[PDB]
Amino acid sequence: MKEVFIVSAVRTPMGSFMGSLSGVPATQLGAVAIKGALDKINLNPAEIQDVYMGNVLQAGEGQAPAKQAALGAGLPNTTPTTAVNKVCASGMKAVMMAAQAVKAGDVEAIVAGGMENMSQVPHYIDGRNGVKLGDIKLQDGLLKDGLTDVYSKQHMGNCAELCAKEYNITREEQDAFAIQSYERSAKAWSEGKFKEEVVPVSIPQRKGEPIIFAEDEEYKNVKFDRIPTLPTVFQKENGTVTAANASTLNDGASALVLMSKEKMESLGLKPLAKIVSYADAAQAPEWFTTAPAKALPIALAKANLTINDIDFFEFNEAFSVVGLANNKILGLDAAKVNVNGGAVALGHPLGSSGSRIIVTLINVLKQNNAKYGAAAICNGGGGASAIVIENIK
Amino acid sequence: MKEVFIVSAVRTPMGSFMGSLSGVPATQLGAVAIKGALDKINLNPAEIQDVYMGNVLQAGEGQAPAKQAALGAGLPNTTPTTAVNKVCASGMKAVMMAAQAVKAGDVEAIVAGGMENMSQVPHYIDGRNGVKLGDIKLQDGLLKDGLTDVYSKQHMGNCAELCAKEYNITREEQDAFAIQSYERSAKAWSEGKFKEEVVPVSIPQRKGEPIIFAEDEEYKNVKFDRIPTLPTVFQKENGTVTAANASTLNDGASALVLMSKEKMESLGLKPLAKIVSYADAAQAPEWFTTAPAKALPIALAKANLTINDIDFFEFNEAFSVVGLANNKILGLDAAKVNVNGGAVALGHPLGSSGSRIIVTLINVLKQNNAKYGAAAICNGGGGASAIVIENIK
Numbered sequence: 152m153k154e155v156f157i158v159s160a161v162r163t164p165m166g167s168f169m170g171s172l173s174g175v176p177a178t179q180l181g182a183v184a185i186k187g188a189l190d191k192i193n194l195n196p197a198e199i200q201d202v203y204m205g206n207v208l209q210a211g212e213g214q215a216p217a218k219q220a221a222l223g224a225g226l227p228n229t230t231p232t233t234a235v236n237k238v239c240a241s242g243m244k245a246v247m248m249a250a251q252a253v254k255a256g257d258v259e260a261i262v263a264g265g266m267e268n269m270s271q272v273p274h275y276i277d278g279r280n281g282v283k284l285g286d287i288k289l290q291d292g293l294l295k296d297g298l299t300d301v302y303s304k305q306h307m308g309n310c311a312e313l314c315a316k317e318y319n320i321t322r323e324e325q326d327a328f329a330i331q332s333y334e335r336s337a338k339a340w341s342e343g344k345f346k347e348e349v350v351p352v353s354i355p356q357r358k359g360e361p362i363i364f365a366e367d368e369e370y371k372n373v374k375f376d377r378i379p380t381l382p383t384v385f386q387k388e389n390g391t392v393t394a395a396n397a398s399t400l401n402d403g404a405s406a407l408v409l410m411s412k413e414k415m416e417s418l419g420l421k422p423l424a425k426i427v428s429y430a431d432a433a434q435a436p437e438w439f440t441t442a443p444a445k446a447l448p449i450a451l452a453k454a455n456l457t458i459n460d461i462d463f464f465e466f467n468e469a470f471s472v473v474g475l476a477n478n479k480i481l482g483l484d485a486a487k488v489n490v491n492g493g494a495v496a497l498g499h500p501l502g503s504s505g506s507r508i509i510v511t512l513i514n515v516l517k518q519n520n521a522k523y524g525a526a527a528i529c530n531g532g533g534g535a536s537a538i539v540i541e542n543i544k
Numbered sequence: 545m546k547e548v549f550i551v552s553a554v555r556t557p558m559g560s561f562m563g564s565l566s567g568v569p570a571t572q573l574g575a576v577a578i579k580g581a582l583d584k585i586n587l588n589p590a591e592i593q594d595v596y597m598g599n600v601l602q603a604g605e606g607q608a609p610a611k612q613a614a615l616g617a618g619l620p621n622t623t624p625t626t627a628v629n630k631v632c633a634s635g636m637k638a639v640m641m642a643a644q645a646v647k648a649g650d651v652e653a654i655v656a657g658g659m660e661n662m663s664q665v666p667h668y669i670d671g672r673n674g675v676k677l678g679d680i681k682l683q684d685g686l687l688k689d690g691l692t693d694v695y696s697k698q699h700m701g702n703c704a705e706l707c708a709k710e711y712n713i714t715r716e717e718q719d720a721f722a723i724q725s726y727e728r729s730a731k732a733w734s735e736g737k738f739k740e741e742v743v744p745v746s747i748p749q750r751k752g753e754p755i756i757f758a759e760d761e762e763y764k765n766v767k768f769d770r771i772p773t774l775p776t777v778f779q780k781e782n783g784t785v786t787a788a789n790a791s792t793l794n795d796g797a798s799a800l801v802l803m804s805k806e807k808m809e810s811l812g813l814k815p816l817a818k819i820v821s822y823a824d825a826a827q828a829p830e831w832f833t834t835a836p837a838k839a840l841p842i843a844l845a846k847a848n849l850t851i852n853d854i855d856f857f858e859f860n861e862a863f864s865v866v867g868l869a870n871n872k873i874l875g876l877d878a879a880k881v882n883v884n885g886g887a888v889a890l891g892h893p894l895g896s897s898g899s900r901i902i903v904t905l906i907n908v909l910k911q912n913n914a915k916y917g918a919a920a921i922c923n924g925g926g927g928a929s930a931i932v933i934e935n936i937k
C-alpha cells in the first residue's frame with residue numbers, strides 16, 4: 152500500500168467561548184488554518200486535489216462550509232471539498248479519510264483538518280409548524296447537537312461522572328490532572344513549543360488596525376486556589392466534574408497537508424511525519440469516555456507495533472476524568488501523555504480537536520527527538536478514533 | 545487495487561415537503577434504509593465495519609446523526625459512524641469514501657448512503673448575543689444552509705437561470721423535460737420498476753395502526769395543463785424556471801452495502817454491481833449546474849472507458865435546465881438518461897439523492913440487461929461527483 156506523509160500541519164490559537172474569535176466564523180478559521188498549512192511549504196494551491204474538514208455544528212454556517220473554508224484559504228474553485236461529522240473525532244476522521252484517498256490511489260495531495268466556532272452556534276426553532284396555543288421552546292444548538300447524548304438525554308458531563316464512578320477516579324485526582332494540564336500548557340507556551348504550529352488570526356476592527364490573535368487564551372482562565380472549591384456542575388451530591396476540570400467550549404481550526412511519496416519528492420518537500428496506521432472503534436454511547444482505549448490497540452495492531460513502541464501520546468482531554476481513565480486502562484506513563492498540555496487547559500473546538508492533537512503530536516515528537524507517536528480522541532455516540540504516526544527526523 | 549462490490553442497495557420512498565414523512569426524522573429514515581439494505585441480503589449486522597451517511601442539513605437532528613441512523617437500523621454499538629456533507633453530492637461522496645476505505649485495505653464491509661428530512665430543518669436565531677434595540681431575524685435553515693449560494697447570496701434557482709441563458713435552454717424545453725420526467729416516473733412505478741429498490745416506512749399514528757408509506761408521492765403532484773402557464777419563480781422578466789420544472793424539497797434516505805471480493809465470497813453473496821471508478825470535480829460556484837459534465841469524464845478516464853461505453857446514465861435533476869444542460873454538453877441521448885424518471889418528478893432530499901441515483905441506476909441496468917452505467921450529481925459551491933458501475937448479471 153502507498154505510504155501517506157504529512158508535509159505540513161498547523162492550527163489557529165484557540166479562543167474562549169464568546170471570546171477573542173467569537174466574531175470570526177468557523178469557515179474563516181478553517182480558511183486561516185488551510186492557508187497557513189499551504190504557506191508553511193509554499194505550496195501551489197492548485198496541487199490540492201480535495202479538502203476534508205471536520206465540523207460538528209454546521210447550522211447557520213451557510214452552504215458547503217468546507218468549500219467556504221477552502222476558497223477563503225485561496226484554493227481555486229477547481230478544488231473539491233467535503234465536511235465530515237464524527238462529533239469530537241471529526242478532525243481526526245477527516246485526516247484518516249484523506250489518507251485512505253491517497254492509499255486508494257485517487258489523490259496525490261489532499262488537505263484534511265477541522266474547524267468549529269462554538270460561540271456562533273445558533274438556537275433552533277421549528278418555524279414551519281405553528282403552535283396554536285402554548286409556549287414554544289428554542290433549543291440551544293450547542294446543547295442539542297453537540298453536548299447531549301441522544302439515548303439518555305443527558306449531558307456528556309454526566310457520562311464523565313459515570314466514568315469517574317466506575318473507574319474510581321476521584322475529585323482530587325481530576326483536579327490534580329487539570330492543574331497539571333494548565334501548568335504544562337503555560338510551560339510549553341513559555342518555551343516556544345507552540346510557535347511552530349500556531350498560525351495567527353487577524354481580526355478586523357470597526358475602526359483601526361486589526362487585532363492579531365496569536366496565542367491560546369483558555370489556559371490563562373484559571374484560578375488555582377479556587378479549583379478544589381468549585382461546585383460539581385453535573386451532579387449535586389457526590390459529584391467530581393467541575394468547570395475547571397472539564398474542558399471548555401472554544402473556537403478554532405486546524406489543517407494538515409497529506410501527500411504521496413511520489414508527489415512530495417517531485418515537489419522537493421521533506422515530510423514532517425508518516426501516517427503509520429489508524430482505526431475507529433465504538434462501544435455503548437454512555438461509554439464513549441473509554442473508547443480511545445479500544446481504538447488505540449486496533450491502530451497499534453494494524454501498525455504491527457506495541458504500546459511500548461510509542462514514545463508520546465496525545466489523548467484529547469474532553470474531561471480530566473477521560474484523560475485519567477484512558478491512562479489508567481492502558482497503563483500509560485502520564486509523563487508521556489499530553490506533555491505540552493491538553494484540552495482541559497487549551498480548549499476544545501469540537502470539529503477541530505481531532506486534527507489539532509495530531510498537529511501538536513507532530514511537534515511533541517520533534518521537540519523530544521522521538522520516533523512513534525499516537526493520538527486518540529473520543530466522540531459522542533460511543534466512538535473514538537486513533538492514529539499512529541512516525542516522526543521523520 | 546482491491547475491487548469494491550455493491551451487494552445491496554435500497555431507498556425509502558420520497559415524501560413531499562411537509563408531506564407523508566414530515567414527522568419521521570432524517571435519522572430514522574436513514575435507519576429504515578440501512579436496515580432495508582441489511583435485510584435484503586440477510587446480513588449479520590456485526591459484519592458492518594463503518595457507516596458513512598450523507599446529510600446536508602444536520603441542525604436539530606441531535607448528536608451524531610449517523611450513529612442515530614446506524615443504531616436505529618439495528619447495527620451494534622460497536623459500529624463506527626460518520627456523517628458527510630458535500631451538499632447535494634453528499635450521498636454519492638459517502639459511497640466514494642466508503643469505496644476508498646475498502647481499496648485502502650481498512651474495511652471489508654461498509655454501509656454508505658444518505659438521509660434528509662427537509663420538512664424538519666429548523667429556523668436559526670443567534671440567542672447568545674442580545675439585540676438591545678431593533679428587530680431580530682430568524683433565518684430559515686433550508687434557505688441559509690441548503691439553497692442559497694454563499695458568494696452571490698442568491699438562490700440556486702438563480703444559478704439555474706444563468707445556465708438556461710448561457711446554454712440557450714428555453715422555458716418550453718425545460719417544461720418538456722419536466723413532463724417527460726413525470727411521465728417516466730409514473731410509467732416506471734406502474735411497471736414495477738421501483739418495487740425492488742424501495743423499502744417502505746411505517747409511520748406510527750396517534751391512535752390505530754401505522755401508515756405504511758411505500759411509494760414516491762411527489763410525481764402525483766402535477767397538473768400537466770398548468771405547467772406552461774406557471775410563473776417563473778426566480779426571475780420576473782424573461783424567466784424560465786418554475787415550481788414544476790424545478791425539483792422540490794423532499795424527505796427520504798438511501799443506503800448501500802459495499803464489500804470486498806473476499807468478504808462477499810466468504811458470505812456466499814452475489815454482488816449487484818461493481819464500482820469501476822469515481823471522481824469529483826469543481827468549477828466556479830455559480831457554475832455548479834454544469835459541473836457533472838466535468839466530473840464524469842474524469843471518472844471515465846479513471847475507468848479507461850469512453851462515453852460510448854456507458855449504457856445508461858443517472859444525472860440528478862436538481863432543475864430541468866440542469867438535466868438538459870449536461871445532456872447537451874456531453875451529447876447524451878436523452879433515451880439513455882434517467883429512464884425511470886428523475887428528481888424533477890420523484891423528489892430531491894439533498895443528502896440522500898447522490899446515493900439514491902446509484903440505487904436507481906443499479907436497477908435500470910438490470911431492467912435493461914446492460915453492462916456499464918454512470919451516475920453524477922452537482923452540488924452547491926460549484927462541485928459535482930460522478931461514479932461508474934458495472935452491472936453483474
Ligand SMILES: [Ca+2]
Nearest residue numbers: 340341342343
Ligand atoms: Ca510568552
Ligand SMILES: [Ca+2]
Nearest residue numbers: 394395397495
Ligand atoms: Ca477547564
Ligand SMILES: [Ca+2]
Nearest residue numbers: 481482483484
Ligand atoms: Ca505501562
Ligand SMILES: [Ca+2]
Nearest residue numbers: 733734735736
Ligand atoms: Ca401502482
Ligand SMILES: [Ca+2]
Nearest residue numbers: 787788790888
Ligand atoms: Ca417539480
Ligand SMILES: [Ca+2]
Nearest residue numbers: 874875876877
Ligand atoms: Ca452523443
Ligand SMILES: [Cl-]
Nearest residue numbers: 433534624625
Ligand atoms: Cl462512532
Ligand SMILES: [Cl-]
Nearest residue numbers: 231232826927
Ligand atoms: Cl465541491
